[PDB]
């Protein structure tokens, strides 16, 4: 009776017949990875020395909210 699917934005589509929620079914999208985009945009990969690149990436990681990621750059 049912069907499920995910999405790139964490949206869940659920359809099930109106005998468990009998000749029709109802569905809804549940608006349940934002850091990925900003991490991709703000990073630096060339055009600077190694130390400057690591420092910039560490600053970006720290500003985004993940510190365990930020300290790895500084350690490197």
């Amino acid at each position: 009776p049912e069907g499920l699917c995910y999405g790139l934005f964490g949206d869940l589509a659920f359809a099930a017949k109106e005998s468990l929620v009998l000749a029709s079914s109802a569905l809804s999208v549940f608006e349940t990875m934002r850091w990925f985009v900003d991490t991709a945009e703000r990073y630096a990969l060339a055009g600077r020395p190694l130390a400057e690149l690591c420092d910039h990436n560490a600053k970006v990681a720290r500003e985004l909210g993940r510190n365990q990621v930020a300290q790895t750059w500084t350690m490197l």
Binding site: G3, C5, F9, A13, L20, S24, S25, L27, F30
Partner: protein
């Protein structure tokens, strides 16, 4: 906490599958009244129907999208013992391309191969035959050839490919049975492609599963070295298929067994990255599960 925004499908019968395409902005719904509908996203923030037609002469069970590289392509299987491929031509013109008519009883599942080895398509059959198609000319979608065929000696009810994109995992497929036989014969099987014999061969069989299977789903790899499989027989189960160093031999292990549903589990799905797993039982609720760096899976949400 998700917000459940409902949309009116206006389908004249049940709904059997929903699928997002590649970008999360279009979905396709298959129903039991021989219709396939397409919904697109607006900047306002709501889904509106942009295409609908009459597909088959039976009951459409599944609809799946293809990779955007090959175009906007859809596939569908039905109770009229066929399988079709459609393309959108620019307004909303959806045109039929082929009709895979080789089956004899019915077609239960249809899935596109991962888009790193061509435009390949695998269809199941209630008689127990899994057939793999191919299109050597990527751009003519009217020329499909039959490359392999597998007989599993049991009713077939599900299918799922291996998305692992590395040059260390020979492509493999998983099929699930639904036979309510009195004997406790295994109902999930795995086949893998051998490079030198140009033939699919049985790799391993999940003996511990002796209950009817309703859904099979692999987990996206994204850099792991082993594989993860989810089965929804009567409780959600997660397996592990770590190989041995150099068919191939896998050491299967059981990682989860969740009877939280107190009913029969119908369908499952994986998030985008093999971190969260969804489920759907007869109680009418969706449930999400996740790991905790000790490989101790636990619930992480209940949605009605």
């Amino acid at each position: 906490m998700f917000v459940a925004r409902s949309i009116a499908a206006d389908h004249k019968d049940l709904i059997h599958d929903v699928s997002f395409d590649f970008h999360g902005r279009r979905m396709a719904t298959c129903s039991s009244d021989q219709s396939v509908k397409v919904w697109d996203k607006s900047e306002s923030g709501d889904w509106h129907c942009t295409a609908s037609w009459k597909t088959h002469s039976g009951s459409v069970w599944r609809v799946t999208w293809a990779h955007p590289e090959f175009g906007q392509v859809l596939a569908s299987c039905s109770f009229d013992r066929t399988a079709a491929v459609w393309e959108e031509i620019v307004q909303s013109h959806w045109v039929k391309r082929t009709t895979l008519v080789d089956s004899r009883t019915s077609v239960t599942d249809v899935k596109f191969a991962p888009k790193h080895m061509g435009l390949m398509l695998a269809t199941c059959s209630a008689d127990g035959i899994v057939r793999i198609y191919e299109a050597p000319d990527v751009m003519n979608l009217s020329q499909w050839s039959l490359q392999h065929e597998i007989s599993c000696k049991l009713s077939c009810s599900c299918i799922s490919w291996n998305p692992s994109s590395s040059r260390a995992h020979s492509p493999m497929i998983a099929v699930g049975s639904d036979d309510s036989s009195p004997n406790a014969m295994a109902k999930v099987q795995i086949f893998e492609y051998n490079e030198n014999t140009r033939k699919y061969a049985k790799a391993e069989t999940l003996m511990t599963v002796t209950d009817p299977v309703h859904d099979i789903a692999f987990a996206p790899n994204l850099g792991r070295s082993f594989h993860i499989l989810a089965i929804a027989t009567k409780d959600v189960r997660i397996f592990t298929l770590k190989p041995v160093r150099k068919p191939t031999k896998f050491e299967i292990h059981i990682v989860a067994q969740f009877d939280n549903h107190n009913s029969q589990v119908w369908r499952v799905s994986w998030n985008i990255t093999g971190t969260v797993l969804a489920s759907s039982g007869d109680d009418g609720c969706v449930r999400l599960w996740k790991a905790n760096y000790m490989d101790n899976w636990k619930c992480t949400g209940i949605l009605k």
